[PDB]
Symmetry: C2
Subunit: 175 residues, 2 copies
Amino acid sequence: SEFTQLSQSIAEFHTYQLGNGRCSSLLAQRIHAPPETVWSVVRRFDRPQIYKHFIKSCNVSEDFEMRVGCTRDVNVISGLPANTSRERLDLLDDDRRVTGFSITGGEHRLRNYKSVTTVHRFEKEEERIWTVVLESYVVDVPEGNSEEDTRLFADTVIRLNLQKLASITEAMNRN
Amino acid sequence: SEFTQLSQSIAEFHTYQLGNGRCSSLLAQRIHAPPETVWSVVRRFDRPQIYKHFIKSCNVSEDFEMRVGCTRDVNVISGLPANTSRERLDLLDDDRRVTGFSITGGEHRLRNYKSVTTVHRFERIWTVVLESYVVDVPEGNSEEDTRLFADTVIRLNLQKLASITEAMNR
């Protein structure tokens, strides 16, 4: 009744098929803000700078329109030299609060990365409406790297981004 | 006096010797906690993992000395292959709350990196932590990018430092 809405998502969107040279992970974050607000940032494929770290800039096309197959160039500085990540919107559903993308090139740390993020309502007593965000990915493990190492990297940045997301979003709920 | 102490600290440790092939920066973090507490975290050369991000592990010698000249191996979390960063403790003055280190090798993104951190009293009781660094920029690489990488990691580390330290006040 409570974690049922969540375990359904995990099953459909955050559950993965142990490929040979591939790895994945799932991460969660509580935000003290309403899902509608959180969703309104997460869904903006156009501007991931708002809740993500290490983004120098993000460019889309002049005639930009958000739809599955959508494209963005993300100029990242989480390493050196700078790096332009070519990413594509894989899915977007404003009703179920589900969005997802992949990295088609330009990012040698995360080859064939595919991610999905889902926002959840959690009202658990003066039950103010809180949120839980889930973010998972699947990605290639570079040959000559351990699963663990590529996983530590992806998880660390996702964790920091989800923390920024919590702040930016918790700020919008006391403004 | 507290602002004189800070300004003199800048002049002595956070001021650098320009220009081409080289770049530097200074960042600051106000932390609502006593500087005594912050300094006891910052001074721990053998465990930067307490407040710094992207460290998989940090190994010291089996008979670890804690004096200028100490070394530490930092296994860094990049998306790249096993990147061990060798760091030397340049400076450690408990009375002035000043530490500093250099990257002697193994970290290709930050060659000849030298950083200094100072902790300052401001009066609850509040602290300011300043951190600056000087690093190489090989020609062809853009100064802006390398600064941006450096500045972002320091910022995140200092935010966590605030958190960890502000938590140590029960």
